[PDB]
Design a protein around this ligand. Structure first.
Ligand SMILES: [Mg+2]
Lengths: 100, 321, 50, 195, 79, 235
């Protein structure tokens, strides 16, 4: 985390598509360095043919500038998450905050 | 390796026979800096020697005085006296006189020659005297101090009594006049950078500069003697006592890189420690249930690959539980 | 505000702290400022320039 | 014996080739060059010393002529490769042989900000400091008293200097006199030549 | 070693002829097979050539005189 | 007296914590305080016998830029935590430790298979986190004693030690000390004045002993000084 921040850092790391954003707030079911499986809450869950959400984190792969782009999970098992909250910090991120 | 590198000096330049330029190579990546700093801080202040500490003119009792018979002020007299080096024997304090008149300038050779002292430079000019009618004399007391005593601490020495109105001179007991150490890069066959030290020192001439370096090294060694390994090696003694039974036997069988299945099968026979299993021939394993091919193979692999085997006769078990 | 935030902790208010030399081991006069700065490694690594 | 063995040894980089590299660059200068070249000083000659790293260590007093700040400027190096070439680079294109700019007689070796700030702080005397009003014999004793910590760096002190003046012929007359200057100037006096 | 050549510029008319005669001396010392008249200090041919030029015993006139002497010795040996 | 002064002597190894220790050298006549303080500080920061990790071997992962189903952190974080781990070996110079763990939980140093001369300075040091019931980790860890610090790059000697894909190299950063502060103060002399006592505080890894490291550094400094204690022209 950068110490002397500007507050805007909480947006760039979230409004972009670099980190794992929560499409539906729910309860954490399975934490892993490769995938993250979340159980949708009863209210946000669809009333039919529904289930649980899965976010496949991208591992070390080449970017467009010969740099590494890796996402690291920053959630714990059983820890309830809200919709829109971050789940995995991408490259140069820390708990949903830009950190270059 | 915990074995450091010792340097081998390759250049000791003795230009002017009173200013030395020594080198040291090679050192560690940071040894040059600390060694130069230690040697400098030692030679600057903590280096015993001898120098002038008291001056008394028979006609002048103040540092400020329009004194006749000399074309120089009293400040120049005190400066020349401070610049006069002298080596004294075991007597740590001695006075001398300078009763002399004449035409030319009084020098260090005109001091009353005493076997207890020794002037380093007799030709050293002290004070230019008036060519006629100038009979001035002054006494100088030298002592054996520790290092430099500036005027601030010197005026405190005056502050003590100064009953006669005694004059004073800056005491510089350090024999070395100046010292400058410089670190540079030295290269071994594949070493990145080692500290090559170059020390340029200049002393009062009372002692050799290499002798001063040797004395500083010896005094630092005597200072550090209280913690030098307590000995040269401090352990020329290697004794190996080993019991017959191995400590691995006391550990439980779960510390042998075995599967949970094999762990459960081993705990089925109430065999927890390894020593309770090494004294058991494999004849008592394939008769144990749930011990077929995979479990038996895993047991015979992870247990005997460590040097020992399964099935042995020993009596020292279990010490002590 | 920065002054009162510094005085909240035990750090000096002036922001400049006395510093000792790593080589000589003596005190630097004129107390140098010191803090925590966020820095960046640019995409101009030397291994792709030499 | 042959070229293949030497090539394989260079590729392997044995401990027996580093001394050879140190010997061949004992007195073999190279040419440093800035990317935008404006005047003659855009290319200079320098004797190289080997350093473990991937960057080119440059003298701080010459880069001012290069107009090359250290914010990521990349410069090029060239090899003379010929005896005539090496002698020319040592004779003409050397940095020592180029101290005055070809445009104006003013020297191009003017010191930069760091050294001038250090010297200014060394010579900027105060009114009261450690050891104000004492006397010193020579600049060596001033440096000793300063490094010992018993005195400050800038303080009005009456010292004795031994200066030299060039006469009409090639003579250097010596005069010793008492001056009233700061300890910094007295310490710096040990650097300037006698003239 | 060698750091400055201004003393060489003093003894020679300019720098161009100076480096020319220095290159001639370097060719004579490296591939010409001639011995250096000044004891070297593990320096290259250029440094010892510049040093011998600075000592004043070697210049363009001295070099052409030596070349003429070598040529007449060679033609006297051939006969 | 005016000459032939005294030498210091260690009197206390009082530790304010398990790692933060303090020593008090006394007495010092004059000026030796800062000298000895800076010298000992530089010698301690320079190089002391360390026992950090050098090589790791995990049967599952092949390269530090991979992952593994079951571990929360990445292989790089695992290597970082292992480098941060400290350990003390006495008998041999290099050793191989085995760590086998299963079940959900924070896998820490207390879960490794210790040995006789191997001592963990702190078991609470977390290594990784297993976030799956039917997930296990079985790894080998090479720990060797060295001097100073060596990165993982320049340590390569041959092209066969890296032929086993499971073998991964971490930069051997072994330094028992981490911060060494010191200060002089007025010593309590019998009948004298301006004697200096040097208090040296050390925040270390807790692996090495304070007095042991102090005496080792003093012996190293004395041996280095011995180079010119009898200086003479020798090549
Ligand atoms: Mg630029």
């Amino acid at each position: 985390k950068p110490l002397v921040g500007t507050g805007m850092e909480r947006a760039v790391a979230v409004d972009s598509g670099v980190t794992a954003v929560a499409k539906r707030g729910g309860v954490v079911q399975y934490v892993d360095a490769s995938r993250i499986v979340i159980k949708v809450n009863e209210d946000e869950m669809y009333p039919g043919e529904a289930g649980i959400d899965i976010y496949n984190l991208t591992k070390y792969t080449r970017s467009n500038q010969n740099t590494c782009i890796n996402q690291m999970p920053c959630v714990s098992l059983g820890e309830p998450v809200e919709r829109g909250d971050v789940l995995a910090d991408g490259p140069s991120t820390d708990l949903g905050e830009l950190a270059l | 390796v915990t074995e450091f590198l010792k340097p081998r000096l390759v250049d000791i330049e003795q230009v002017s026979s009173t200013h030395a330029k020594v080198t040291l190579e090679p050192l560690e990546r940071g040894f040059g800096h600390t060694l130069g700093n230690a040697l400098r801080r030692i030679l600057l202040s903590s280096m015993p020697g001898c120098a002038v500490t008291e001056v008394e003119i028979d006609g002048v009792l103040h540092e400020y005085s329009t004194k006749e018979g000399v074309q120089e002020d009293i400040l120049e007299i005190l400066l020349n006296l401070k610049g006069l080096a002298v080596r004294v024997q075991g007597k740590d304090e001695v006075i001398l006189t300078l009763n002399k008149s004449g035409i030319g300038p009084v020098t260090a050779a005109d001091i009353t020659h005493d076997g207890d002292v020794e002037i380093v430079k007799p030709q050293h000019v002290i004070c230019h005297l008036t060519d006629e009618n100038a009979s001035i004399s002054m006494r100088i007391k030298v002592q054996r101090g520790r290092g430099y005593v500036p005027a601030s601490t010197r005026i405190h020495s005056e502050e003590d009594e100064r009953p006669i109105g005694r004059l004073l001179v800056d005491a510089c007991y350090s024999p070395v006049e100046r010292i400058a150490y410089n670190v540079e890069a030295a290269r071994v066959e594949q070493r990145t950078d080692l500290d090559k030290l170059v020390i340029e020192m200049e002393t009062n001439g009372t002692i050799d500069p290499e002798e001063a370096i040797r004395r500083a090294a010896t005094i630092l060694a005597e200072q550090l003697e209280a913690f030098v390994d307590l000995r040269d090696v401090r352990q020329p003694e290697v004794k190996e006592e080993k019991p017959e039974f191995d400590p691995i036997l006391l550990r439980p069988v779960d510390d042998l890189e075995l599967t949970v299945r094999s762990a459960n099968c081993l705990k089925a026979e109430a065999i927890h420690y390894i020593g309770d299993l090494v004294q058991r021939t494999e004849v008592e394993l394939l008769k144990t249930p749930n011990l077929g091919k995979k479990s038996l193979t895993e047991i015979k692999d992870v247990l005997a690959s460590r040097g020992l085997s399964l099935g042995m006769r020993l009596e020292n078990w279990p010490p002590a539980s | 505000e920065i002054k009162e935030l510094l005085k909240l902790g035990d750090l000096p208010t002036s922001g400049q702290i006395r510093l000792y030399d790593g080589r000589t081991g003596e005190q630097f006069e004129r107390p140098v400022t010191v803090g925590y700065m966020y820095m960046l490694k640019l995409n101009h690594l030397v291994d792709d320039k030499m | 014996t042959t070229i293949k063995a030497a090539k394989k040894m260079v590729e392997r980089e044995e401990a027996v080739v580093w001394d050879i590299l140190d010997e061949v660059i004992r007195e073999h200068p190279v040419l440093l060059n800035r990317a935008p070249t404006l005047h003659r000083l855009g290319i200079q000659a320098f004797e190289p010393v080997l350093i473990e790293g991937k960057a080119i260590q440059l003298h701080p007093l010459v880069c001012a002529a290069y107009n090359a700040d250290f914010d990521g400027d990349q410069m090029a190096v060239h090899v003379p490769l010929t005896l005539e070439a090496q002698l020319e680079a040592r004779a003409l294109m050397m940095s020592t042989n180029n101290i005055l700019s070809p445009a104006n007689g003013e020297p191009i070796i003017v010191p930069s900000q760091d050294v001038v700030l250090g010297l200014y702080y060394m010579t900027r005397d105060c009114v009261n400091a450690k050891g104000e009003g004492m006397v010193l014999t020579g600049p060596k004793e001033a440096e000793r008293l300063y490094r010992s910590g018993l005195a400050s760096l800038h303080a009005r002190v009456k010292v004795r200097i031994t200066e030299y003046e060039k006469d009409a012929n090639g003579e250097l007359v010596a005069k010793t006199s008492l001056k009233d200057t700061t300890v910094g100037r007295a310490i710096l006096w040990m650097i300037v030549p006698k003239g | 070693a060698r750091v400055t050549v201004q003393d060489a510029v003093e003894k020679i008319g300019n720098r161009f002829d100076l480096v020319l005669v220095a290159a001639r001396r370097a060719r004579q010392m490296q591939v010409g097979g001639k011995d250096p008249l000044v004891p070297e200090e593990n320096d290259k041919t250029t440094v010892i050539a510049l040093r011998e030029i600075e000592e004043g015993l070697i210049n363009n006139q001295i070099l052409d005189v030596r070349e003429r002497q070598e040529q007449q010795e060679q033609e006297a040996a051939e006969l």
